[PDB]
């Protein structure tokens, strides 16, 4: 389960980089797995097993109840400002099994909003307004397009705002080079901290330095700084085993100066190809078995989309993401 979620996060990350090897990445693994686990409440047979194995659960060792309860407890763990919500937007005439709507509310905290997708601009605005509210205005356009024949959309959002334990002073932020490669740079506002003592590990074998910066309360961020031109080689080593080794190797070190850019990045993704590469196939096909939603094998996934935003500044950071699973008739 911990192992599953870490294995899933790094498997997904590697597929995102393969698809767009020259772009920034920001995403939320937990948003994606929660949306897909929500979907799996309604899946059967091969459609189900592919989703849950794609999320990296071992179905010989873990039951579906254990999986859904892990997301229920995670949702409690999330709800410093941290929030996560789930919703289903459903054509009002679509007949839904009581078990599906009850389990969605109990396990995922999801209501069912009757939605007229044939009035597609209004349906799109309702979903986008739901996500805008959940993300405190940071994600306004999760849904770019919505087919008038859509039957259901499952939505997850996450919002995380935190203050640094040791905030940067804006008077120490100065324009400095950020090297895109050995020969080319861009100028960025470079924040700095001085004379701090934090967890640190120089990994000479993997040509990278790892540190932890704390937030207030009980959260922190793991940073991995590859030597120049070693990012791809570090990425190839991402795994539960490597992350655990890094965590086990951190020791407190006095740092004279730490420099971190002030910046915001965002990414929007179509995850269809990504999820197929993870083995989630039948849900998208004419053979989809989502018969736990309606009682009939009459629904298939059309698209899974994800958007995420990261803002790093002197006082703290803000992170938000959302995932939508669009479903049509077969």
């Amino acid at each position: 389960l911990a192992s599953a979620n870490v294995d899933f996060a790094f498997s997904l990350y590697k597929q995102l980089v393969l698809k767009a090897p020259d772009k920034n990445v920001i995403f939320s693994p937990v948003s994606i797995s929660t949306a897909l686990a929500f979907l799996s409440l309604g899946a059967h047979n091969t459609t189900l097993t592919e989703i849950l194995k794609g999320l990296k659960f071992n179905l010989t060792e873990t039951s579906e109840a254990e999986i859904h309860q892990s997301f229920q407890h995670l949702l409690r763990t999330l709800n410093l400002q941290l929030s996560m919500g789930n919703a289903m937007f459903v054509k009002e005439q679509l007949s839904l099994l009581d078990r599906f709507t009850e389990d969605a509310k109990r396990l995922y905290g999801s209501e069912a909003f009757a939605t007229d997708f044939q009035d597609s601009a209004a349906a799109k605005k309702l979903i986008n307004d739901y996500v805008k509210n959940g993300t405190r205005g940071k994600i306004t356009d999760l849904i770019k397009d919505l087919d008038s024949q859509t039957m259901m959309v499952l939505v997850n959002y996450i919002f995380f705002k935190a203050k640094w334990e040791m905030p940067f002073d804006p008077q120490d932020t100065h324009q400095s080079r950020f090297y895109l490669s050995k020969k080319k740079w861009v100028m960025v506002p470079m924040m700095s901290l001085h004379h701090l003592t934090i967890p640190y590990f120089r990994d000479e074998e993997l040509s990278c330095t790892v540190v932890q910066l704390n937030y207030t309360g009980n959260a922190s961020v793991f940073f991995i700084l590859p030597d120049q031109d070693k990012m791809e080689e570090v990425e190839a080593m991402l795994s539960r085993e490597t992350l655990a080794r890094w965590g086990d190797s951190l020791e407190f070190r006095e740092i004279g100066e730490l420099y971190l850019p002030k910046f915001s990045i965002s990414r929007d993704y179509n995850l269809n190809d990504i999820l197929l590469q993870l083995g989630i196939e039948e849900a998208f096909t004419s053979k989809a078995d989502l018969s736990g939603i309606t009682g009939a094998r009459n629904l298939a996934v059309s698209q899974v989309v994800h958007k995420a935003v990261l803002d790093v500044f002197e006082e703290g950071t803000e992170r938000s993401a959302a995932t939508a699973v669009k479903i049509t008739l077969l």
Binding site: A2, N24, T77, L225, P226, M231, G256, I265
Partner: protein, 33 residues
């Protein structure tokens, strides 16, 4: 003196302590999209 200078591509990971799930992950290849 140890200096840590994030002036080239780097990764960040938010790991939840209550579950050890990864809530967010990023690669910063260019801070100015």
């Amino acid at each position: 003196r140890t200096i840590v200078r994030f002036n080239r591509p780097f990764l960040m990971i938010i790991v939840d302590h209550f579950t050890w799930s990864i809530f967010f992950m990023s690669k910063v290849t260019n801070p100015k999209q």
